[PDB]
Amino acid sequence: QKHRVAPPPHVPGHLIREIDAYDLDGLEQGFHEAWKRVQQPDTPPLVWTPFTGGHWIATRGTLIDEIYRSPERFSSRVIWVPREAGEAYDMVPTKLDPPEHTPYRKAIDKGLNLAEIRKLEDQIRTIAVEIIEGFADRGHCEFGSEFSTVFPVRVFLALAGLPVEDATKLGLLANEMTRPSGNTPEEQGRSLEAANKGFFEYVAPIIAARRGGSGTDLITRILNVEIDGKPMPDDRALGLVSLLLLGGLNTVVNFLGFMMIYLSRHPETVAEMRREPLKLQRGVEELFRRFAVVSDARYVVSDMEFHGTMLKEGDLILLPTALHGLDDRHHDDPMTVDLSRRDVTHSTFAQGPHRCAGMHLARLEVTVMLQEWLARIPEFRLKDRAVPIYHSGIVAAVENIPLEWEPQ
Template sequence: MNTDTIAPPSAKHRSPIPEHVPAELVREVDAYGLEGIEEGVHEAWKRVQQPDTPPLIWTPFTGGHWIATRGALIDEIYRSPERFSSRVIWVPREAGEAYEMVPTKMDPPEHTPYRKAIDKGLNLAQIRKVEGDIRAVAIELIEGFASKGHCDFAKDFANIFPVKVFLALADLPMEDAAKLNALAKEMTRPSGNTPEEQGLSLKTANAGFFEYVAPIIEARRGGTGTDLITQMVNSEINGAPMPEDKLLGLVSLLLLGGLDTVVNFLSFMMIYLARHPETVEEMIAEPVKLQRGVEEMFRRFAVVSDARYVVSDMEFFGTQLKAGDLVFLPTALHGLDDTQHENPMKVDLSRRNVSHSTFAQGPHRCAGMHLARLEVLVTLQEWLARIPRFSLKKGAAPIYHAGIVAAVENIPLVWKV
């Protein structure tokens, strides 16, 4: 969703405040149009997390929902599916109800066998087997522009590298990337100025994914290929073939996860490094710090924010929640929580006890985290080996977008050849 099309605050759709929500907990925070976003998505979320901000706040925007503002709550909610269900994980609610991908919208124990099916192709041992291929893709891209002395990092690397890697793992043609990227953006940053409009945008994009994967599933049923989709399609659930609707949801989720998250993470990370040459120098001087620093990067630049559905009335961190309420979980606010991390906006390669929810927690911990970690490590190693010193072009103004997955574009980098 382009920030130019976001309605001004006075024109945004506001939902009525429910009776059980105290007035002192209400804050006007729009998850798709954060105040101060021109300075950066993480900077804008950090503005929400002030010392006097309650652990749970209520916003009337995007259909009306709670927002968890501290790491302790985000961590506990993710780990507690019996109290905080995944049946609606998007805001606004209309978008969450239109979302049909599995197993992200399932709770244990129904969720468990589907998660095992995904893990079969994305576990650490499997990912290590393709490290050479992943590294070759990164090297080819970087060497394609290293001698020019400039690139648009988002356009020339981040939007290509993880997508090319993932489509190769799924045995899909790179020429399908543009279509799939457009669908992914409407899933994670659905357009529209009312909950109903955003719900319709997401429903249309979800249907687009299903339409794309249906013939692929059919073609690979009974196949013996080692690609991710063939493995998924021929997995059994509780001893029986996977139901058709769940297959559509599972394969679509694989594509959505592979096409929008690492893409944007890499771009946020590289903007920071371009502005902090001292951190880059530290990585070059001590390669071990570079390797250890990958987790610090994930802490600092979390891009996903999803929601959970309150199963029953309860008191949580001193706040009354009602069954059916939605709690939004900006994972950035766990990594940036200054009650858990000293000077959290700084990338500290020597930081100990790094805690974050960038990959979520509990049963829905990201299945693609091993691939993501490797892609980030490879990017840093191969980039710094060829372009050790770089900066943002003078006058550069990256364009930031908030949503279920935060995004950024327009990242002109320059360096001496």
């Protein structure tokens, strides 16, 4: 049974669309495909759904880009749907607007800037090689459970100086953040609250131990960046370290599954990467354009008209990032990966002040993964008749990716 809310007075009937972000119509065919069903040639730039507590959805790339770039009009004070979950959410600095956001972002950038990420290339490569060597000779693997859920997790836990045995409990918390359980807004709110608390409980002793610490790990490094001349307060630190884990341990995992399903079905595209290593390197950003996974929100700061649509203060707008990179008004033949595509503009990492702090790390993980994968398993396919299973929410997920190849 689907929970519906009645539309508020300012939402006209002709803009209503029954879209469930947590269980999209057509999701069994794929997450991207399911969002693309929403983006029809004449569909309005903003539509309103009665599901998930009632909210807007931006349906075109130009709006998505603009909203992310405009924090004075579209605040991060709520970035999740339903509102109850968004109000429970306590991660830093994603809940902050400038100027409060800026010193926390500066602190994160001390650890995640491109020059720092470059130093990690060899470590990341070693991890990828070790995992791939476990199955390359075998001729098959279930890519989700044996690679995509393993590689980024080992990379990030190593970088954060945390034990690998914590991966399972952290993954469970992350799943309830990005796809909270429940069939009511209030239930999903409670699920998010519990997961967010679980994170805080995990990180609290780590913060206490690493304040003023001598560790070289990512957490010590970022934690000990001063905020306005003083140590970061406890409340902010909890949200900050939690966010690092949430993003670092999960988002790339999901991206890799979608990417690899496509590649498994497009041997010609894989062959291009194998034959031209620079095409692989220069083509990674096209993969980010094509396999967006985040759909999050902003809070309308003031009553306004935006793209011909009346919005009220407090309205939530969901931003399905896939609808920028895959917008046929921005990219011709948007569902094909064209490694030589010159314009790859997308909002896979969002835009504006919150534009993904981990984006250099994401790009490097994917680049290293492809290089080491193709070196050891040059050709591969999805098992005949296999059906991946898809999940939609604030971050998309996919499982059951059985690959097969002739060992080289």
